[PDB]
């Protein structure tokens, strides 16, 4: 019953046709789906498996293994907040407190409107700019609550 | 065209090689790259035999910048000893804590990397090459995709490159959250569309890798050196830094320094010089307590006068320098390292699976003051017993840094036992 919209199916086909072997496209495909829906719908995996010519079990195992994928919470904007050593030293907790002040949520939580989810992540490879966060694909250094509030106001 | 936001990491060079352009925080496209002589090393390489290129890279004494420092030329020789076809993989997974050296090459001077990939691929007879970039580097992904297209348009990729009869496509794969996918065999598994599970080595990839074929995996920074070796010749390259450990090296410096960023320096520079001469010293002029070499090693303030080379007494690793000063709690810091390994073990090996988990769980109890005597003794045991039966380097090192803190800062740990 569950079918991909054509604009999304077309994009997945591009990924599948990109590498020499179709199965190589699995992670690009999963990123695409998550970008489209705000999460990985459980019902998407079966048809994805068919396009990849892989068993459903294989696809599920891959989704479970890779931490960037989320099969539970739909969110328009993922605020990934680094919680590793350098950001922790340089003020992860200040960023988190500012986020709770502005949005009223803590890591792992989603705002009631589905707009923002906070995702604690390991080192984002930007440690000189600690404390680091992403909003979907955009990455930033946290300076202060006022600065953060302005950045988040760009995401409507 | 338009790319996701990237913070502007500070970059400074004494050698003006890897960071000649990447010292400026913006994308340098193919025309800018060509003006400085971009792709001329490739043209020169295509007029050399693959064997000669390997010889030069060997005599340059280039060593793997991914952190293990394996001789690059020797690695290549090993691969070419085995029947084709062969594959070339650029490792852009960079996920070690404190480590952000490779991304500035990717994001600011992608053609330096691409040029290296093409030369290296030609040298080992690979017609298919890969960049595997972590999923948390989306800007890098799109910047690489656009650069590859630019290179194609100018005839540096495709069939019959510049009339040489050499064919190459470079495919860009993305990670999706696993540090372990930077381990070369797990990277290969991920490229094959599977979970990122390391394989028993040997075989090394140069014997059996992608689809079981001879595969060279090299780090971004390693590959970025290849242009220069062909350009200057190996002799002139070896005149950079100490003759034993030659060439430029990138040093991502973070934590409690005035000037955090990437420094391009020779490898006879000392750790003290990195911190004080180049990175501006410590915040608040506080005393250095420790340096964490990523999540691999912990150096005390009595070990600052070591060279930043691949020698036995040297700093080694990725060159990653995380500075803690006198008020930073070493146990709090160790907990963060334990937490990292807990989140990244792939779980294939039992002592690694359980050890990484228990080390974090028990250290947290210790830190919060809720650890029983048994918890304490258990922590010590577990820390010394993550390595057994391990088939990759994660299991082998997940207790290493923490053990080093235990030996070098006993007074601070003993306070937690109180
Ligand atoms: N840059 C980053 O983000 C990260 C870097 N690392 C680094 O990873 C390092 C460990 O990496 P490994 O691959 O386990 O080290 P390794 O020492 O086992 O191997 C190094 C390289 O040499 C090759 N090699 C070694 N012996 C060989 C032989 N006899 N024949 C042919 N090829 C051979 C291996 O295939 C590999 O490509 C650590 O030192 C750490 O610094 C770790 C995590 C993240
Ligand atoms: C757990 C873990 C994780 C990583 C690695 C190792 C291990 C044990 N390695 C090192 C990798 O396996 C291999 O040594 C290098 O990619 C080989 O290239 P060079 O010889 O350094 O150019 C590695 N290397 C790299 O280039 N980037 C990375 O992100 C990682 N990550
Ligand atoms: S040592 Fe740990 S990370 Fe490496 S293969 Fe074994 S379980 Fe996985
Ligand atoms: S520790 Fe946060 S980006 Fe590296
Ligand atoms: Na407030
Ligand atoms: Na320029
Ligand atoms: Na990854
Ligand atoms: Na190895």
Curated annotation (Swiss-Prot), chain A:
Pfam families: 2Fe-2S_thioredx (PF01257)
UniProt keywords, alphabetically: 2Fe-2S, Iron, Iron-sulfur, Metal-binding, NAD, Quinone, Translocase
InterPro entries the UniProt entry points to: NuoE-like, NuoE_dom, NuoE_N, Thioredoxin-like_sf
Binding locations of [2Fe-2S] cluster: 82, 87, 123, 127
Cofactor binding note: Binds 1 [2Fe-2S] cluster.
Stored PROSITE patterns: COMPLEX1_24K (PS01099)
EC number annotated for this UniProt entry: 7.1.1.-
Biological processes, Gene Ontology terms: respiratory electron transport chain
Keyword Repeat: no
Catalysis performed (reactions): a quinone + NADH + 5 H(+)(in) = a quinol + NAD(+) + 4 H(+)(out)
Cofactor field: [2Fe-2S] cluster
Function: NDH-1 shuttles electrons from NADH, via FMN and iron-sulfur (Fe-S) centers, to quinones in the respiratory chain. Couples the redox reaction to proton translocation (for every two electrons transferred, four hydrogen ions are translocated across the cytoplasmic membrane), and thus conserves the redox energy in a proton gradient.
Similarity section: Belongs to the complex I 24 kDa subunit family.
PANTHER family: NADH DEHYDROGENASE [UBIQUINONE] FLAVOPROTEIN 2, MITOCHONDRIAL, NADH DEHYDROGENASE UBIQUINONE FLAVOPROTEIN 2, MITOCHONDRIAL
Protein name from the UniProt record: NADH-quinone oxidoreductase subunit E
Species for this entry: Aquifex aeolicus (strain VF5)
Taxonomic lineage: Bacteria, Pseudomonadati, Aquificota, Aquificia, Aquificales
UniProtKB/Swiss-Prot annotation, chain B:
InterPro entries to which the protein is assigned, alphabetical: NADH-UbQ_OxRdtase_51kDa_CS, Nuo51_FMN-bd, Nuo51_FMN-bd_sf, Nuop51_4Fe4S-bd, Nuop51_4Fe4S-bd_sf, Soluble_ligand-bd
Residue positions binding [4Fe-4S] cluster: 346, 349, 352, 392
EC number: 7.1.1.-
Binding locations of NAD(+): 64-73
Catalytic activity: a quinone + NADH + 5 H(+)(in) = a quinol + NAD(+) + 4 H(+)(out)
Known cofactor(s): FMN; [4Fe-4S] cluster
Cofactor binding mode and count: Binds 1 FMN.
Domain of life the protein comes from: Bacteria
Keyword annotations: 4Fe-4S, Flavoprotein, FMN, Iron, Iron-sulfur, Metal-binding, NAD, Quinone, Translocase
The keyword Zinc belongs to this UniProt entry's keyword annotation: no
NCBIfam families: PRK13596.1
Functional note: NDH-1 shuttles electrons from NADH, via FMN and iron-sulfur (Fe-S) centers, to quinones in the respiratory chain. Couples the redox reaction to proton translocation (for every two electrons transferred, four hydrogen ions are translocated across the cytoplasmic membrane), and thus conserves the redox energy in a proton gradient.
Family: Belongs to the complex I 51 kDa subunit family.
Name this protein carries in UniProt: NADH-quinone oxidoreductase subunit F
Gene name of the record: nuoF
